[PDB]
Amino acid sequence: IISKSYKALINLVQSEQLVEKIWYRVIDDSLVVGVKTTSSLKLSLNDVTLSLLMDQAHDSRFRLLKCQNRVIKLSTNPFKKECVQIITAVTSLSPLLTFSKFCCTVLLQIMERESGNCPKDRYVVCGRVFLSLEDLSTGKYLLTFPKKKPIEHMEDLFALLAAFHKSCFQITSPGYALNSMKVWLLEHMKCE
């Protein structure tokens, strides 16, 4: 009966998979959770976020939990063509490792902007993140530098593009052209 009535609860408030999947990465004292989207979900029309929600079974108290959200758009083999939109949350770790362990669950919230009715306030429950010192002691989600130079699980790239301090710039050389970039990048800086 109990089960029957939850499912009743869920058709009470209310098909197409609007989210790929959940994945999570540990950086240093930073939790980076992320998600791959689908073409269905239009970030043009839809302000979205992502929270983290702690299990009170573990957390006997109210510590508040804050999470920073990034939207990352990358073009895939540009030289239609696939863009990759990924959405990802960031927070502290030491506060969560209080019980040697914790199980957070993930919420992607969506809202429309066009309609001034606040009509379409959908969500998704986009999975659940189990973690512990037994897991971290064997790496598994960490990024520990140089051995993990050759980046081949792209979530590790996506973790670094979520965790890091982003800073955006224009360079204008108005009586030259500007090409030394690639040399400094490739030769001086030595970029793969």
Judged by the rule CB under 8 A, the positions of this chain that interact with other proteins are 2, 5-6, 8-9, 12-13, 26, 28-29, 53, 56, 60-64, 66, 93-95, 97-101, 133, 136-137, 139, 142, 144, 147
Distances (CA, A) of 176 to 18, 126, 172, 181: 47, 50, 9, 13
Determine phi and psi for 81, rounding to 5 degrees: -75, 140
- Given the structure tokens 């998979």, which residue do they identify? 17
CB of 183 to other proteins, least distance (A): 18
CA dihedral 71, 165, 50, 122 (to 10 degrees): -40
Please tell me the distance from the alpha carbon of residue 7 to that of residue 150, in angstroms, as a whole number: 45
Shortest Å, Cβ 144 to other proteins: 5
User: Of 53 and 161, which has the nearer Cβ to other proteins?
Assistant: 53
Question: Least distance in Å: CB of 170 to other proteins?
Answer: 19
Nearest residue (CB) to other proteins, 61 versus 80: 61
Q: Least CB distance from residue 94 to other proteins, whole Å?
A: 3
Of the two residues 2 and 168, which places its CB atom closer to other proteins in the complex?
Answer: 2
Per DSSP (E only), the strands in the chain are: 19-26, 30-37, 46-48, 51-53, 68-75, 83-92, 101-112, 123-132
Nearer to other proteins, 21 or 130 (CB): 130
